[PDB]
């Protein structure tokens, strides 16, 4: 199915995923399309930061849902 990820930038990407995909799977998909290391990624939905181990379905995240991608910035 399809969901959208809005990057820090505000860039809006599409992702092909299953409800059974883990938040971790999703982060590796994001790394594949946009080149962002997963350990830098915070995916947020409905005011909650989403846990790597859980699935899109564990989160009741349906088709064409939009996630926010906030980065961890170190220096």
């Amino acid at each position: 199915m399809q969901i959208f990820v809005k990057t820090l930038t505000g860039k809006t990407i599409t992702l092909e995923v299953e409800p059974s995909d883990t938040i971790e799977n999703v982060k590796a998909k994001i790394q594949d399309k946009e080149g962002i290391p997963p350990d830098q990624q915070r995916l947020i939905f409905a005011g909650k930061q989403l846990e790597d181990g859980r699935t899109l379905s564990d989160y009741n995240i349906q088709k064409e849902s939009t996630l926010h991608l906030v980065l961890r910035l170190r220096g």
């Binding site: 820090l8 915070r42 930061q49 961890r72 220096g75």
Partner: protein, 153 residues
């Protein structure tokens, strides 16, 4: 300026600009305590190269209070105690996680502007605005300096 609250007390925004157009940049050492030097710069009078030690202490008490519930501490995956031992080491990098905890601990707003030589985004900890906030510059993906709003604003 358009801020969206993605999680409680955390806001994101997407303006594009050169940093030199709105801010003076006050460069900070490369030692790499820069995140702490940058906060000292903007919050501590008589700030010198040793002032950061005190922000590291406010960071240590902030963590004792907020670390275990910070969303971003889940990407760190250290116990509160291991985090502390690492964070208090000399040269240890600060980040958006310390900005979130210091915002609460110091009752301030901190904004980190990251630059992809221009500005790609900002992340804001706390409810205040660019004028009353502590403004940090994140550059090269690996470095912080302080910013001061230019005189005419």
């Amino acid at each position: 300026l358009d801020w969206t609250q993605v999680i409680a007390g955390q806001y994101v925004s997407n303006p594009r600009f050169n940093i030199s157009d709105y801010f003076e940049i006050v460069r900070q050492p490369g030692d790499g305590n820069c995140f702490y030097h940058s906060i000292a710069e903007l919050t501590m009078p008589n700030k010198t190269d040793h002032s950061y030690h005190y922000i590291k202490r406010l960071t240590e008490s902030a963590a004792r209070k907020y670390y275990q519930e910070e969303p971003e501490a889940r990407l760190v995956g250290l116990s509160l105690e291991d985090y502390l031992k690492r964070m208090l080491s000399d040269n240890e990098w600060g980040s958006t996680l310390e900005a979130s905890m210091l915002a609460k601990e110091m009752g301030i707003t901190i904004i980190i502007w990251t630059v992809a030589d221009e500005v790609e985004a900002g992340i804001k900890f706390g409810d205040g605005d660019v004028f009353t906030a502590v403004n940090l510059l994140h550059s090269g993906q690996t470095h912080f300096d302080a910013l001061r709003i230019l005189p005419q604003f």
